């Protein structure tokens, strides 16, 4: 009688449901999502223009169709507003749902930045398919986009929006693209690639204010530059959605704290994907999420299983400058050395023993992904 309840129809929620349904085809399944519930791959949002897709072209299946495939009831445009761990239930306004086990697959939230002026709200995040639809709606017939952020997500969009015909101005107070993730020299090559497409960078300033001016907007940066634009993309970064878990008394840190079995601090509640911090590791990518779905499915079907991340390199979708990066796992030190020249750069991180523990590859140098991957240590020891 008691359902498995999954909050989320992203890649985490849908892949868990699918992996689990190979194991248990009888237990009722309820899926709940705040969006339209359509199946789609979020990674593809940053390639839509180069593939000449609109939002609907990126949808792979309607939620009703998924409901048949998974033998599930799927509630769409339904916001869970609380978790009641002491009574094994969740809240949706003033209605409740009992669960057998609850799975939190509710993702991460865009990082807001303070902006002034009478247009300070005209900032478009792109963190799901509906966001993408709302951005495309606003961008029709426009020429210029201001983009806030210079991480992986910001760089991918800047690349695709440029291929899509838009003239981009990227603003970010960090000193390099993809800070934290990327060695300076390889970041420089990626930035150069994007500039080659016409992207203009402003690294160091923030957006001070946004005002309505004539045909569109004027963006006043903190250094006094005024940049005419039609709309603004907010892609500063992401942080795991923790508010509802913490209020419910679940342990949180960077994300929702789970062990290698994906269990939270409370019986019958698990978490996976962008929202989950797995044994200290909150990794906002598909590869660890897939490992988690496979293991958690087993546990939910009564076969206690753990994840164990091997090497999980990051493939950055910037066609203007191809990039694959694998930062060294946490607790490991080494020296960085830049081999190659120009756009074809190979930056290796070696321990004292001479072993490659991390890398960044740009241009032609991405071909040697596979040979380097064999030497790599896992993200979990």
Partner 1 sequence: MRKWQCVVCGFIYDEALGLPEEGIPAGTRWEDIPADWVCPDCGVGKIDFEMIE
Ligand X SMILES: Cc1cc2nc3c(=O)[nH]c(=O)nc-3n(C[C@H](O)[C@H](O)[C@H](O)COP(=O)(O)OP(=O)(O)OC[C@H]3O[C@@H](n4cnc5c(N)ncnc54)[C@H](O)[C@@H]3O)c2cc1C
Binding site for partner 1 (CB under 8 A): 11, 15, 41, 43-44, 47, 60, 285-287, 290-291, 312, 315, 317, 370-371
Please indicate if the annotation marks 84 as binding a ligand: no
Please indicate if the annotation marks 119 as binding a ligand: no
DSSP 166: P
> Per DSSP, what are the bridge partners of residue 75?
32
Rule CB under 6 A: is residue 273 a binding residue for ligand X? yes
Going by C-alpha positions, the residue among 235, 231, 48 that lies closest to residue 143 is: 231
Q: Are 25 and 71 in contact (CB under 8 A)?
A: yes
Q: Are 189 and 340 in contact (CB under 8 A)?
A: no
Cα dihedral value 334, 339, 341, 344, nearest 10:
-80
Element (H, E) at 137: helix 129-139
Nearer to ligand X, 117 or 309 (CB): 309
Please indicate if the annotation marks 80 as binding a ligand: yes
Cα dihedral value 278, 280, 282, 283, nearest 10:
-90
Please indicate if the annotation marks 33 as binding a ligand: yes
Rule CB under 6 A: is residue 16 a binding residue for ligand X? no
Nearer to ligand X, 13 or 329 (CB): 13
Nearer to partner 1, 126 or 231 (CB): 126
DSSP 281: B
The separation between CA 331 and the C-alpha centre of its own chain, rounded to angstroms, equals 24
Please indicate if the annotation marks 131 as binding a ligand: no
Span interacting with ligand X, options 3-11, 48-56, 175-183, 205-213, rule CB under 6 A: 3-11
List 10, 117, 240, 329, residue binding ligand X (CB under 6 A) = 10
Please indicate if the annotation marks 11 as binding a ligand: yes
Rule CB under 6 A: is residue 34 a binding residue for ligand X? yes
Q: Are 168 and 139 in contact (CB under 8 A)?
A: no
Rule CB under 6 A: is residue 105 a binding residue for ligand X? yes
Rule CB under 6 A: is residue 274 a binding residue for ligand X? yes
**Residue 290 interacting partner from ligand X, partner 1, none (CB closer than 5 to 8 Å by kind):** partner 1
Residues 277-302 as b or e (16 or more Cβ within 10 Å = b): bbbebbbbebbbbbbbbbbbbbbbbe
**Residue 34 interacting partner from partner 1, ligand X, none (CB closer than 5 to 8 Å by kind):** ligand X
Nearer to ligand X, 192 or 287 (CB): 287
Rule CB under 6 A: is residue 294 a binding residue for ligand X? no
From the CB of 194, what's the least distance to ligand X, in Å?
A: 15
List 101, 156, 230, 277, residue binding ligand X (CB under 6 A) = 156
List 3, 8, 117, 255, residue binding ligand X (CB under 6 A) = 8
Rule CB under 6 A: is residue 30 a binding residue for ligand X? no
Q: Are 97 and 5 in contact (CB under 8 A)?
A: yes
List 317, 359, 362, 372, residue binding ligand X (CB under 6 A) = 317
**Residue 347 interacting partner from partner 1, ligand X, none (CB closer than 5 to 8 Å by kind):** none
Give the Å distances, CA to CA, from 56 to 50, 59, 62. 15, 5, 10
* Strand-strand pairing, 72-75 and 29-32: parallel
Length of the chain: 381
Please indicate if the annotation marks 42 as binding a ligand: yes
Q: Are 105 and 6 in contact (CB under 8 A)?
A: yes
Site for ligand X in 120-149 (CB under 6 A): 127
**Residue 106 interacting partner from ligand X, partner 1, none (CB closer than 5 to 8 Å by kind):** ligand X
Nearer to ligand X, 186 or 289 (CB): 289
**Residue 264 interacting partner from ligand X, partner 1, none (CB closer than 5 to 8 Å by kind):** none
Q: In what side-by-side order are the strands of the sheet with 82-84?
A: 82-84, 89-92, 95-98
* DSSP line for 305-344: ---------EEE--TTS-EEEEPPPTT---EEEEEEETTE
Given the rule CB under 6 A, which residues bind ligand X?
7-13, 32-35, 42-43, 45-46, 79-80, 105-107, 127, 153, 156, 241, 273-274, 284-287, 289, 317
Q: Which residues are annotated as a binding site for FAD?
A: 9-12, 33-34, 42, 80, 156, 274, 286, 317
């Amino acid at each position: 009688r008691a359902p498995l309840v999954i909050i989320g129809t992203g890649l985490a929620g849908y892949n868990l449901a699918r992996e689990w349904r190979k194991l248990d085809g009888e237990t009722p399944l309820l899926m709940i999502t705040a969006d339209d519930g359509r199946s789609y791959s979020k990674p593809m949002l940053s390639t839509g223009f180069s593939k000449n897709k609109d939002a609907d072209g990126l949808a792979m299946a309607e939620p009703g169709a998924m409901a048949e495939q998974l033998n599930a009831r799927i509630l769409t445009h339904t916001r869970v507003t609380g978790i009641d761990p002491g009574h094994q239930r969740i809240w949706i306004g003033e209605e409740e749902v009992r669960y057998r086990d609850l799975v939190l697959a509710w993702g991460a939230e865009p990082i807001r930045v303070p902006v002034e002026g009478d247009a300070q709200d005209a900032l478009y995040p792109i963190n799901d398919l509906e966001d993408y639809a709302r951005f495309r709606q606003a961008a029709a017939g426009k020429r210029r986009v201001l983009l806030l952020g210079a991480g992986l997500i910001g760089c991918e969009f800047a690349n695709d929006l440029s291929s899509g015909g838009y003239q981009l101005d990227v603003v970010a107070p960090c000193e390099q693209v993809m800070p934290g993730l990327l060695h300076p020299a390889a970041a420089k090559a990626v930035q150069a690639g994007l500039e080659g497409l016409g992207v203009r960078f402003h690294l160091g300033p923030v957006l001070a204010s946004l005002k309505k001016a004539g045909e569109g907007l004027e963006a006043h940066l903190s250094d006094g530059e005024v940049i005419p634009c039609d709309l603004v993309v907010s892609a500063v970064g992401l942080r795991p959605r923790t508010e509802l878990a913490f209020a419910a008394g679940l342990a949180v840190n960077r994300g929702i704290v789970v062990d290698r079995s994906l269990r939270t601090s409370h019986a019958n509640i698990y978490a996976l994907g962008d929202c989950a911090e797995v044994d200290g590791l909150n990794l906002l990518y598909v590869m660890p999420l897939m490992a988690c779905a496979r293991a958690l499915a087993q546990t939910l079907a009564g076969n206690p299983s753990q994840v164990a991340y091997g090497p999980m390199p990051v493939t950055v979708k910037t066609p203007a400058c191809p990039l694959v990066v694998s930062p060294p796992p946490r607790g490991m030190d080494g020296q960085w050395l830049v081999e190659g020249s120009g756009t074809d750069l190979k930056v290796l991180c070696r321990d004292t023993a001479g072993r490659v523990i991390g890398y960044a590859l740009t241009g032609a140098a991405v071909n040697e992904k596979l040979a380097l991957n064999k030497e790599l240590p896992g993200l979990m020891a």
